[PDB]
Design a protein around this ligand. Structure first.
Ligand SMILES: O=C(O)c1cc(C(=O)O)n(Cc2ccc(Cl)cc2Cl)n1
Length: 223
């Protein structure tokens, strides 16, 4: 009955996984709530994550998260994939996210030639774009609402219009549903998210998305 506790070392990998979903046309966001939450934990670090859970009364069986190279056959030819050792997310699911993302990337090349940095799966702000949706869901959880989904989509289409222009897979309805699902199924993620947001919103300036997140997070307490 383990909880994966990713450390700072797999932060870049989790951001890239977020970015792979963000470039996927009609992406399956079933795992985005979990992946976003894994990104938040990698930003907090393993030590602070275990501290948060233990202090909150949750008894945690910590699973170490490392990057492994998994060799698997796709269309007759053997391919190498970098995956995370996660008890909550199978090797198969991770590899299929990379496969679907690579199909959307080839379609992009065919449409516009080589892709600008801000349109790629490895843009440094992908994890934070996902956590912006989490910040909107947390507000609706706070306000007492349950059928707050309609307002999440509507607020998201306004606040994240530049990012939605950059990413075909930024689908607020599906992503909000995935976070609602993870916060109700795993309430310990609410404590992790709140500690992440308090710590993030301390870091002054930086990136446009980091600023959008800090603003969205600050709102959950009256703004
Ligand atoms: O020249 C590049 O940087 C490059 C090449 C490719 C590709 O061939 O899919 N891609 C996309 C890509 C690479 C790696 C992974 Cl893990 C996922 C995706 Cl979508 N980027």
């Amino acid at each position: 009955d383990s909880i994966d506790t990713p450390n700072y070392d797999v932060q870049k990998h989790i951001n890239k996984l977020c970015g792979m979903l963000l470039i996927t046309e009609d992406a399956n966001h079933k795992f985005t709530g979990l992946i976003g939450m894994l990104y938040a934990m990698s930003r907090l670090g393993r030590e602070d994550t275990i501290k948060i859970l233990r202090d909150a009364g949750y008894h945690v069986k910590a699973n170490g998260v490392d990057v492994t190279t998994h060799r698997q056959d796709i269309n007759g030819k053997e391919m190498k994939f970098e995956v995370l050792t996660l008890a909550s997310l199978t090797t198969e699911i991770q590899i299929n996210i990379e496969i679907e993302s690579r199909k959307s990337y080839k379609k992009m090349l065919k449409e516009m030639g080589e892709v600008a940095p801000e349109y790629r799966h490895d843009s440094p702000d992908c994890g934070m774009i996902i956590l912006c949706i989490a910040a909107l869901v947390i507000t609706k959880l706070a306000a007492g609402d349950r059928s707050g989904l309609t307002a999440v989509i509507r607020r998201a289409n306004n606040v994240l219009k530049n990012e939605m222009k950059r990413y075909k897979g930024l689908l607020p309805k599906d992503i909000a549903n995935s976070f609602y699902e993870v916060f109700e199924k795993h309430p310990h993620f609410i404590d992790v998210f709140v500690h992440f947001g308090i710590a993030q919103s301390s870091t002054r300036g930086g990136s446009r998305v980091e600023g959008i997140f800090a603003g969205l997070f600050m709102n959950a307490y009256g703004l």
